[PDB]
Paper text:
We tested the functional importance of residues in the specificity loop in PfLDH with an ‘alanine scan’ by individually mutating each residue in positions 101–108 to an alanine (note Ala103 was mutated to a serine). Mutating Trp107f to Ala reduced pyruvate activity by five orders of magnitude, whereas mutations at all other positions had effects less than a single order of magnitude, including the canonical specificity residue at position 102. The Trp107fAla mutation affects both kcat (1500-fold decrease) and Km (50-fold increase). To assess the effects of Trp107fAla mutation on the specificity loop conformation, we solved the crystal structure of PfLDH-W107fA (1.1 Å ) in the presence of oxamate and NADH. The protein crystallizes in the same space group as the wild-type PfLDH, with nearly identical cell dimensions. In the W107fA mutant, the specificity loop is disordered between residues Thr101 and Arg109, as is often seen in structures in which the loop is in the open conformation. In the mutant, residues 112–115 are in a linear α-helical conformation, in contrast to the wild-type PfLDH closed state which has a very prominent 60° kink in the α-helix at Pro114. Thus, the only significant difference between the wild-type and mutant structures is that the PfLDH-W107fA specificity loop is found in the open conformation, consistent with weaker binding of substrate. These results indicate that Trp107f is necessary for pyruvate activity in apicomplexan LDHs, and that it has become the new ‘specificity residue’ despite the fact that Trp107f does not align in sequence with the canonical specificity residue at position 102. Mutagenesis within the insertion indicates that only a single position, Trp107f, contributes strongly to pyruvate activity and specificity.
Numbering used by the authors:
A (entry chain A), B (entry chain A), C (entry chain A), D (entry chain A): 3 to 81, 94 to 316
């Protein structure tokens, strides 16, 4: 079986462990710096193997060397711009341990701001560029897809959409790349099934969804976890899904030496393909704004 | 639980019963005119409830009144243009029994030529237009999607495509409506990841797939069954999937008083939406050719 | 689709909503008395329909009349013996609203001490005895089954076991009723694959598991949620699983007028069968101790 | 991904390929000696990746060297006692190719009489004893479990039962080892929920089920396929299920140098445990009769 190490056993970590057992995806280590909490979560979660018909070990850890043997490492560890150097130090520490203990693992970074943190961990861990990605577009687009599906009264997964550049407030929502059952969304607009003004409000809701959830006295963690597991599952099972993730750009969109959100194909070799959308000049200008903000924050991270 | 009656317990019927138990979708009746064969298939299939963790009854029947209580009726019963009046007589007979025993059932017609047979059964059963559809586009597009996915090395379901008008040799393969991970296929052509000539060969392979399978000394029945169950499941579970099926046209594409293939939304109310693609004049001319052939065959069916 | 109302949107409520969407079981209402928190959790969870390929609405509520239309109601609402009258008052309030708004719903009670609270809600809601059960044995036995499976290196679900009488410290762990792959556990003891002393330590661990998790700075909520969803799913899908739950006793084990834990069969009619284990006199004496403690606490609840 | 080679692409082979794609278990090769038929079945089945959300290659083969790289090999190839030397010759041929091309594969033998054929293939292939098993008990017990579940109105999987010794007419149906929800069946008999006479009729039905299906003008192949896939899945996913299979006996039950049916644990190391039921002297005498018949037939196979 695969060994999946969750570096960070907080809110997202707990849901990931739950879903991994539900899906029987592999053995799980809940790693954290907080003493014994991961052992407690692991114990609770382990019992769900019975209900789920699964056979995944779930263990807790406070010991970095339990990274040894990991096939997948998912980094949610962390805790304004003031946090950037603190979370950088966490990425440095984790990277040194990945390099030593599991240099061949597939790495998914979640810690915000993710497009910065994923590149910092790439640098500190030394893993190949096809073996480390960041969460962003699967989550952001799940929101956009879902909101459109409820307006159009269709199955949520039948809406497809692209959000690129970065996770966070500069995300680029590409109206031209929305489809419903594979059909351009513009046909539905033309038929007055959804209006341009409705879509503008949905776009703004998508950008502000994390804030909306926080203002309702909750935290966004279940959908982030589910998005991460969709990514990890595509790797583990060699599904070769097209999923939008933060990945190293090497000239796509006119950008290099930086990570940003774009469709990729995830399978057994990691990032098997980086797909470059054929953006028009106006869309590219928005992409550039997203990259500029990643670069601004990266400079502050040290 | 739902009661699903398979009117026709041949090759497609057997796989449908298998998949219904796998998915725990409902109780199954394998109905046929052949004596005892459906009882034998039902007995074999019923044991798979243990392996599948399901609880679906599977029974055989030679008695039409076992249609009573059906929530879903799937018609594969049947056996050149010479067959048209013989299969019409089968649709007449089945329709009379549906009208009497299960007028509120959701009906899926499979018997070829499906766009003719579905309308004949609509007429003979009296069910509402939102409660009867024919298999076509889910199956035809599964082939197109699959062949493209193997060229592009992506997950099969991540290719979406539209084939409309009719099932059979006049099916309309809409190049403009192919996407990969929600991205227009033309971007992949522009990047020389797949060529126009490759796609032409894939289109011809799609049209001729049933013949290809027969020439390899096999029969097309597993994918037809899986396509039908995808449709039935969307109804039973109120998924509201966008699925291309044969449905009554009431002016879409300039056509009325005939069934043809188009995207529809399938949920608990049956056909909840008929989606009309905004075809251009050249695509519409191909659609017209498909309808004309359905009409030609319908006239021969009596 | 089914409508599932989670009366209580805390830790267990959140995981239940997650699992319901994963399993596409029905629309979900997260109801709570805390303002807006359920709306926030509902919003986060709703996005997972995309990742899960599901179509379940997830809404929050602070309005009791949203119980109207519920097919299943799961009660986790609540917050030593000092709490008994406070949680009784919560059961009274919920019961009045169930009686008015959804008297035909299937009710699962979770609030501790569950064997007391389930009967109080039965009394206050007026629902039939086959339509209300309490969580206990599925959860307690998941722990016992799991711990044994890890010693014997077998699939967790292949261990079966019975814990009866009550949830909590007087639970009756029935050594005679443990099997592995359907084989009596005693054969494995005879073969020195597990010893009697190992099993004694596992029994004590099972009884004290909730305390163990709390002492590790965690809370038991994921496995409780999964156990509840196994119960709810058996009802919704008419699986007729044998599951140990708290149910009204009408003479079984020599007890009436009280709820206690025993195997039941859960299907579309609710509790379709109450199974009475043929306990020996010594096992019965332990059962009596469990009932006595439920009665002691019920008297304090008012 | 795993590579699963189906040596034999007939009735059972076709269903296995269908189920492997449904479960996304691995790439599939349909191998047969019949020209092109496996290619045709493979082509049909491959399209179901779209409906199933899977990514399994399905190919046909007439070339034995396509065994190279196989992780799992499932042998259904074959076609009274007169057939024994003909099917032996098929096992010899297959064994030579396994030894050359995939000596590290996990092998499941199905060809009848399975307890003879599995040992012949063990001998001819040279694989280790923990890496080759025969289908029998999962299938025979699925029938027994199912029939009892329908009498008792419980979920089929909640009945557990043991049938040992051999597949075929000398199978040993162990009344003492039947449970319902983990409870001895005798408690249900004592409660007059099922009688001893009913169980005798169910036992006879179980022994004669293949004949019953054939006499109904059908063939037993769907449940055999599902049983085989349950076994293969337990290996591939390291589930460590307890499953009754034909395996090499090394003194269990007083028998050596022969294969017979007994519970085993199947996981990533193949047969991880052989479980010896603690049979009484009368049960052992029936076990001996089953082994004697395997030995009689093996002698005739050459
Ligand atoms: N990329 C995206 O789309 C999203 C990113 N996020 C980010 O994900 C991160 C995690 O979010 P939650 O799980 O909700 O937070 P959380 O606060 O519940 O969990 C973070 C955990 O990291 C642990 N931690 C701190 N230093 C560590 C170290 N060196 N090694 C291991 N563990 C360590 C903490 O003790 C804590 O348990 C945050 O940075 C958040 O902003 C959240 C949602 C979406
Ligand atoms: N719409 C589509 O995309 C496709 C349609 N088809 C069509 O589906 C149909 C079924 O195909 P298979 O299952 O492979 O054929 P099959 O020949 O195996 O099964 C047809 C069954 O219908 C039964 N039957 C005849 N009259 C009947 C009656 N009055 N009531 C009930 N059963 C009756 C037969 O005895 C036979 O068992 C054929 O018409 C075939 O051309 C096949 C593949 C795809
Ligand atoms: N039966 C069993 O096996 C188990 C029972 N439990 C019990 O389950 C209950 C819930 O546990 P958690 O979810 O972890 O607790 P929690 O404290 O996270 O959630 C309880 C929720 O109930 C809400 N609430 C209070 N009064 C309410 C009302 N009138 N209507 C609706 N909501 C109301 C609270 O605001 C809170 O959000 C507790 O009583 C706990 O002891 C926990 C585990 C196992
Ligand atoms: N162990 C058990 O519980 C059960 C065993 N069986 C046995 O399973 C076997 C298969 O049954 P079905 O699939 O229904 O039969 P089938 O006749 O449909 O398929 C057998 C296939 O083996 C092929 N074959 C013959 N020689 C071959 C070779 N050297 N290499 C590869 N393929 C070759 C044939 O061409 C045919 O396609 C039979 O021996 C049957 O008695 C069937 C049911 C249960």
């Amino acid at each position: 079986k695969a060994k999946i190490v969750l570096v960070g056993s907080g809110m997202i970590g707990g849901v990931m462990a739950t879903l991994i057992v539900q899906k029987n995806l592999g053995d799980v280590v809940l790693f954290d710096i907080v003493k014994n909490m991961p052992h407690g979560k692991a114990l609770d979660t382990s019992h769900t193997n019975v209900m789920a018909y699964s056979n995944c070990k779930v263990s807790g850890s406070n010991t970095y060397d339990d990274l040894a043997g990991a096939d997948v490492v998912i980094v949610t560890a962390g805790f304004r711009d003031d946090l950037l150097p603190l979370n950088n130090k966490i990425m440095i520490e984790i990277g040194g341990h990945i390099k030593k203990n599991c240099p061949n693992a597939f790495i998914i970074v979640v810690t915000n701001p993710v497009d910065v943190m994923v590149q910092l961990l790439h640098q500190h861990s030394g893993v190949p560029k096809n073996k480390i990605i960041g969460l962003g577009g699967v989550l952001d687009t799940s929101r956009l897809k879902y909101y459109i599906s409820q307006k159009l009264n269709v199955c949520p997964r039948d809406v497809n959409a692209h959000i690129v550049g970065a996770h966070g407030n500069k995300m680029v929502l590409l109206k031209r790349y929305i489809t419903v059952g594979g059909i351009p969304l513009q046909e539905f607009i033309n038929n007055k099934l959804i209006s341009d003004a409705e879509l503008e409000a949905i776009f703004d809701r998508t950008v502000n969804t994390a804030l909306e959830i926080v203002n309702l006295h909750a935290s966004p963690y279940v959908a982030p976890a589910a998005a991460i597991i969709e990514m990890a599952e595509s790797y583990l099972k060699d599904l070769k899904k097209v999923l939008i993730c933060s990945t190293l750009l090497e000239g796509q969109y006119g950008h290099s030496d930086i990570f940003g959100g774009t469709p990729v194909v995830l399978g057994a070799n990691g990032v098997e393909q980086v797909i470059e959308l054929q953006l028009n000049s106006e869309e590219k200008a928005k992409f550039d704004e997203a990259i500029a903000e990643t670069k601004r924050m990266k400079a502050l991270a040290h």
